[PDB]
UniProtKB/Swiss-Prot annotation, chains A, B, C, D, E, F, G, H:
It comes from Escherichia phage lambda. This is Terminase small subunit. It is found in: Host cytoplasm. ATP binds at residues 31-36. Residues 1-29 are annotated as: Winged helix-turn-helix (wHTH). The small subunit is responsible for the binding to multiple recognition elements within the packaging initiation site cos. The terminase lies at a unique vertex of the procapsid and is composed of two subunits, a small terminase subunit involved in viral DNA recognition (binding to packaging sequence cos), and a large terminase subunit possessing endonucleolytic and ATPase activities (DNA maturation and packaging). The terminase binds, cooperatively with the host factor IHFA/IHFB, to the cos site at the junction of adjacent viral genomes in the concatemeric DNA. Belongs to the terminase small subunit family. It comes from the Viruses. Homodimer. Heterotrimer of two small and one large terminase subunits. The catalytically competent terminase is composed of a tetramer of heterotrimers. The tetramer forms a ring structure large enough to encircle duplex DNA. Host IHFA/IHFB induces bending of viral DNA to facilitate the assembly of the terminase tetramer of heterotrimers. Interacts (via C-terminus) with the terminase large subunit (via N-terminus). The N-terminus contains a winged helix-turn-helix (wHTH) that binds the viral DNA. In the homodimer, the wHTH motifs are positioned on opposite sites of loop and probably bind to separate R elements in the cos site. The N-terminus also contains an ATPase site that regulates DNA binding activity. The central part contains a region for the self-interaction. the C-terminus contains region of interaction with the terminase large subunit.
Amino acid sequence: MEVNKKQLADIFGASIRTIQNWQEQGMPVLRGGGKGNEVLYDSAAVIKWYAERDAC
Amino acid sequence: MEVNKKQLADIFGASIRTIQNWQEQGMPVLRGGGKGNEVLYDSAAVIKWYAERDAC
Amino acid sequence: MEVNKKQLADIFGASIRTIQNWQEQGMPVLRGGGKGNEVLYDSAAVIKWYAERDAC
Amino acid sequence: MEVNKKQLADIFGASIRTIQNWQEQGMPVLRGGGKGNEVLYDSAAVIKWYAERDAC
Amino acid sequence: MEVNKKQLADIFGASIRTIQNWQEQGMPVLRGGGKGNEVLYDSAAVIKWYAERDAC
Amino acid sequence: MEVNKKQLADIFGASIRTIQNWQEQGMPVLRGGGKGNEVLYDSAAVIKWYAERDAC
Amino acid sequence: MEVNKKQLADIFGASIRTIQNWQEQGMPVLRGGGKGNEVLYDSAAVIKWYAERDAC
Amino acid sequence: MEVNKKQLADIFGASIRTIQNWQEQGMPVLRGGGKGNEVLYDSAAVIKWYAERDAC
């Protein structure tokens, strides 16, 4: 599902700064409008990204 | 995040049948009652369980 | 007060499925204590949530 | 005992999200460590903090 | 979580004698299965009991 | 690529303050975000903007 | 020897995820300072625990 | 801002030695140069590095 940074953090039971550090490490982001629009995330793709970090 | 089966499925980009199927394999359930009760899930704990299943 | 889903729907004169909607929309839930006892609610907090829905 | 966020949550019959919310409210942390090692908690110290929070 | 007497003491950072005295004062216990299974505890229920001892 | 202020400054071999100064001078921003939203930049767009500014 | 989590994984030829699950299973941990110092391990103590998992 | 070792220490309310020790621990340096070059720092990047050090 479509989530904002705050909603993503809550889904992971994590800090917002925990979210931002993951972004720096190549964590996927969705879209918006270009200046005047919050960063959006696909929870499914973030979960897949989190999982493949330590997949064999 | 505390979510229902439909929400958890949305979060994972999965079918409800996949969530039921994960539960049968031992996926953690947060307070979820029995009868007259919808089940609540810890999205964060289900995500933890997910990654550790094919983790190294 | 400490109420279950049945008691809460009762207090709101609503269907249980309606209570399940409010939960999916972000309505506050207590911390029961695991997959043994039901979801619990704080009636006071649910009322404030209900009221702050169209408080602006 | 020394536990991770998921264990502390299991111990309290709570969500991982509830643990994070408690962390923001001043809930004691044993080994926050540093980005590289997850956060460790003193279950005894968290319980003492929980009990002192709604006590006379 | 489901714990034995030794695990519950460690969770409380306490003496097993401390636990046995809580039992006498009415601290909640789980069930088992006729000769073999030790006394089991719901950590969540025990914390709830610990806190209610002088809650407002 | 989509980067935060620190990453952009790292990419340019510049201080974060120079990035803020470029922002005030009309450097393109990708995700302005709400509050609690960090600012996201398009590295490719900031580079094009950089080259145009003293190009002949 | 005294090692941090990254160092113990390398000693074991393992992922960080593997070390964390062992911790969850009761693998010994040292002490520190209180949220600042990383989790520390006694390699000797950890090896004894690894071996005693199915020593006769 | 771009500041020298003495300025950064003053900004942090810290000893120059602490700054050196943070440098050994991986703290970002801006204009480092070689010899006949004193070290410049991005105060904004050092602050970010500081906060994420014991952040969740």
